[PDB]
Design an enzyme around this catalytic site. Structure first.
Site, PDB file in Angstrom:
ATOM      1  N   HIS A  41       0.805  -1.223   0.000  1.00 42.42           N
ATOM      2  CA  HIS A  41       0.000   0.000   0.000  1.00 42.42           C
ATOM      3  C   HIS A  41       0.847   1.287   0.000  1.00 42.42           C
ATOM      4  O   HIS A  41       0.279   2.364  -0.166  1.00 42.42           O
ATOM      5  CB  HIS A  41      -1.074   0.020   1.106  1.00 42.42           C
ATOM      6  CG  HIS A  41      -0.579   0.178   2.514  1.00 42.42           C
ATOM      7  ND1 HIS A  41      -0.060   1.381   2.979  1.00 42.42           N
ATOM      8  CD2 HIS A  41      -0.680  -0.676   3.556  1.00 42.42           C
ATOM      9  CE1 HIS A  41       0.202   1.194   4.262  1.00 42.42           C
ATOM     10  NE2 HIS A  41      -0.145  -0.031   4.655  1.00 42.42           N
ATOM     11  N   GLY A 143       2.321   6.104  10.181  1.00 44.10           N
ATOM     12  CA  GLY A 143       3.739   5.963   9.863  1.00 44.10           C
ATOM     13  C   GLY A 143       4.353   4.658  10.347  1.00 44.10           C
ATOM     14  O   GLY A 143       5.497   4.350  10.012  1.00 44.10           O
ATOM     15  N   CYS A 145       3.358   1.619   9.561  1.00 43.20           N
ATOM     16  CA  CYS A 145       3.270   0.496   8.619  1.00 43.20           C
ATOM     17  C   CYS A 145       4.646  -0.008   8.211  1.00 43.20           C
ATOM     18  O   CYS A 145       5.593   0.776   8.121  1.00 43.20           O
ATOM     19  CB  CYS A 145       2.406   0.841   7.419  1.00 43.20           C
ATOM     20  SG  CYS A 145       0.689   1.180   7.861  1.00 43.20           S
TER      21      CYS A 145
HETATM   22  O1  LIG Z   1      -1.062   3.947   7.423  1.00 47.36           O
HETATM   23  C1  LIG Z   1      -2.177   3.448   7.379  1.00 47.36           C
HETATM   24  N1  LIG Z   1      -3.003   3.379   6.307  1.00 47.36           N
HETATM   25  C2  LIG Z   1      -4.350   2.920   6.637  1.00 47.36           C
HETATM   26  C3  LIG Z   1      -5.334   4.109   6.718  1.00 47.36           C
HETATM   27  C4  LIG Z   1      -6.335   4.114   5.582  1.00 47.36           C
HETATM   28  O2  LIG Z   1      -7.033   2.865   5.504  1.00 47.36           O
HETATM   29  C5  LIG Z   1      -6.198   1.794   5.315  1.00 47.36           C
HETATM   30  C6  LIG Z   1      -6.748   0.718   4.637  1.00 47.36           C
HETATM   31  C7  LIG Z   1      -5.971  -0.397   4.395  1.00 47.36           C
HETATM   32  C8  LIG Z   1      -4.659  -0.409   4.811  1.00 47.36           C
HETATM   33 CL1  LIG Z   1      -3.708  -1.846   4.566  1.00 47.36          CL
HETATM   34  C9  LIG Z   1      -4.088   0.669   5.470  1.00 47.36           C
HETATM   35  C10 LIG Z   1      -4.872   1.785   5.764  1.00 47.36           C
HETATM   36  C11 LIG Z   1      -4.127   2.440   8.090  1.00 47.36           C
HETATM   37  O3  LIG Z   1      -4.900   1.783   8.756  1.00 47.36           O
HETATM   38  N2  LIG Z   1      -2.859   2.886   8.466  1.00 47.36           N
HETATM   39  C12 LIG Z   1      -2.380   2.886   9.831  1.00 47.36           C
HETATM   40  C13 LIG Z   1      -1.819   1.744  10.391  1.00 47.36           C
HETATM   41  N3  LIG Z   1      -1.629   1.547  11.702  1.00 47.36           N
HETATM   42  C14 LIG Z   1      -2.002   2.514  12.528  1.00 47.36           C
HETATM   43  C15 LIG Z   1      -2.605   3.729  12.112  1.00 47.36           C
HETATM   44  C16 LIG Z   1      -3.037   4.730  13.018  1.00 47.36           C
HETATM   45  C17 LIG Z   1      -3.626   5.873  12.559  1.00 47.36           C
HETATM   46  C18 LIG Z   1      -3.804   6.081  11.198  1.00 47.36           C
HETATM   47  C19 LIG Z   1      -3.404   5.141  10.291  1.00 47.36           C
HETATM   48  C20 LIG Z   1      -2.797   3.929  10.714  1.00 47.36           C
END
Ligand SMILES: O=C1N[C@]2(CCOc3ccc(Cl)cc32)C(=O)N1c1cncc2ccccc12
Ligand SMILES: O=C1N[C@]2(CCOc3ccc(Cl)cc32)C(=O)N1c1cncc2ccccc12
Ligand SMILES: [Cl-]
EC number: 3.4.19.12
Lengths: 305, 300
Positions: A41, A143, A145
């Site tokens: 992603h 951040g 990921c």
């Molecule tokens: O960086 C990303 N992108 C996201 C956001 C958009 O929706 C998606 C959908 C699918 C996937 Cl694989 C990723 C994402 C996600 O969850 N995270 C984040 C990971 N972990 C914690 C987070 C804490 C706050 C904010 C975003 C966080």
């Protein structure tokens, strides 16, 4: 004495963390040999995330679109390919700090250490369990990921998790290092939810053995139970079924403390039906299920890496 | 989102752990530059643990009586000196993995990561706090002496603890890296006991702010309290007094969540009176006191 939620020493993994940037998105990568692994992603805009065609988004990228930074040194990307939900960036330099490693896919109930990272820099290490609903109750901000989960067995790092997303309930979802998600999750901004979770029974029993080893015996009783009567109680209290495999795995702890596994089950059954009665076990008022039987033996014996 | 007991990554400290042997005793040493720091009790025999005269025991040792092993490489001890309860073994090789570091003595309530080691090899990392009674609730077995506690804010390792002993209640006592014990403890096997411990109030408040930041507000109430009335109540539950310093320190969290410190104190008073009523706060059924205000801001 003492029993803490203990992570593996993270040094071997710290030497693999890099920063990966693609366009406006910056996340973490795991640099092993001449490959940097990261969530696929990283190539998506927020709009692409709504319904991404990763093959189509990736074909449009050139190697120079992936900026990889290892400390204050820019690595050159010389190739890129996708394996399931992980992107593999071939770099021109093998990581000299690559430890002995393997990629292993873990089962629900298994624990691992997470090295939370931001901008390719490790910030913290904590111990997690893969929940029965395939989520992890992690601690991750924007951040994070590409942060990884791992175990160490002797001198070998077994990488088992790479962080991808946070679900609406604040719990986390990710993949193994082959890019296969744990759980029925997809890497897309669409309605997704963690399913109803259950308690990891074998791990609660392991933690009760740890409590006994550490001098807490108040919950012990004269009773025993059958595996079927205990499983009827576990089903009632949203606990995972206890199999004969779990009983066999708890054998060493049963022999050391003198409390048979089914004898400890009768203790657990009484705790489920009556509570703790104002008491605590290892400083907890809840039954802890994020220590496996192996973690208990390892911590109560002092195994080093 | 999420809130975990998080340790600092231990790699910078792992590269400093060595094994120190003197006679029949083997424990851990911290190798920084050309010095290996370790508990001075490594020089004690079975007849020395009640009233050791460390100056007298040390004068009798030669450099070759200290065997230092860094991985599978024996380091040569070329000098030795004692500073309070720590022995400093000068070695002929500077540790090439020496990180940017400092020695800091912490106050009760402060948290730090512990890298538990045996035979110079790290086994695990965990988070803990210096209790108000100057002990730590660690996880240490025989051979863990010399394991260190540290923080790594801003790429510099601040070493704050070196493990020396386990008290009869299963809690732990140690020194700073200048060899000064935390608490009224001595490196002697004479009868010693941890004093009555108390809850780190400022840390419980910090953790309630973490819970609010993470979306949990069930424990909030329409009340406030004076600082003195809060302390009168809190003391009855064996909580540490909350000082104006603690209130000032909680200022940033108060501004971020919009909940005044004395309003959060009123919530804590009610939690002490009522318990949780089957509810949890950040996955805990007890009030957590091993997150400082600084840890909460760092993690959130
Ligand atoms: O960086 C990303 N992108 C996201 C956001 C958009 O929706 C998606 C959908 C699918 C996937 Cl694989 C990723 C994402 C996600 O969850 N995270 C984040 C990971 N972990 C914690 C987070 C804490 C706050 C904010 C975003 C966080
Ligand atoms: O290695 C030592 N020596 C001890 C033993 C004798 O009494 C004293 C008295 C003073 C001093 Cl400074 C050390 C010691 C001590 O507590 N530990 C241990 C440290 N930490 C955990 C232990 C878990 C089980 C067993 C012993 C553990
Ligand atoms: Cl401090």
């Amino acid at each position: 004495s003492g029993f803490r939620k203990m992570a593996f020493p993270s040094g071997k993994v710290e030497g693999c963390m890099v920063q990966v940037t693609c366009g406006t998105t910056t996340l973490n990568g795991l640099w092993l040999d001449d490959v940097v692994y990261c969530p696929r992603h990283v190539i998506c805009t927020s709009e692409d995330m709504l319904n991404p065609n990763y093959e189509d988004l990736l074909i449009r990228k050139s190697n120079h679109n992936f900026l990889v930074q290892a400390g204050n040194v820019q690595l050159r990307v010389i190739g890129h390919s996708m394996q399931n939900c992980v992107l593999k960036l071939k770099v021109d330099t093998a990581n000299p700090k690559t430890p002995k490693y393997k990629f292993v896919r873990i089962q629900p109930g298994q624990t691992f250490s997470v090295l939370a990272c931001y901008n390719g820099s490790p910030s913290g290490v904590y111990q997690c369990a893969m929940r029965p609903n395939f989520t992890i109750k992690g601690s991750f901000l924007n951040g994070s990921c590409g942060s990884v989960g791992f175990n160490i067995d002797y001198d070998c790092v077994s990488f088992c998790y790479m962080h991808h997303m946070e679900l609406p309930t604040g719990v986390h979802a990710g993949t193994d290092l082959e890019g296969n998600f744990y759980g029925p999750f997809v890497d897309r901004q669409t309605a997704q939810a963690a399913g109803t979770d259950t308690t990891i029974t074998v791990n609660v029993l392991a933690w009760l053995y740890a409590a006994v080893i550490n001098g807490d015996r108040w919950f012990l009783n004269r009773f025993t139970t059958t595996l079927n009567d205990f499983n009827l109680v576990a089903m009632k209290y949203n606990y995972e079924p206890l199999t004969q495999d779990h009983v066999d795995i708890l054998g060493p702890l049963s022999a050391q403390t003198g409390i048979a596994v089914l004898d400890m089950c009768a203790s657990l059954k009484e705790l489920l039906q009556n509570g703790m009665n104002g008491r605590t076990i290892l400083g907890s008022a809840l039954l802890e299920d994020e220590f496996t039987p192996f973690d208990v033996v390892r911590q109560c014996s002092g195994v080093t890496f």
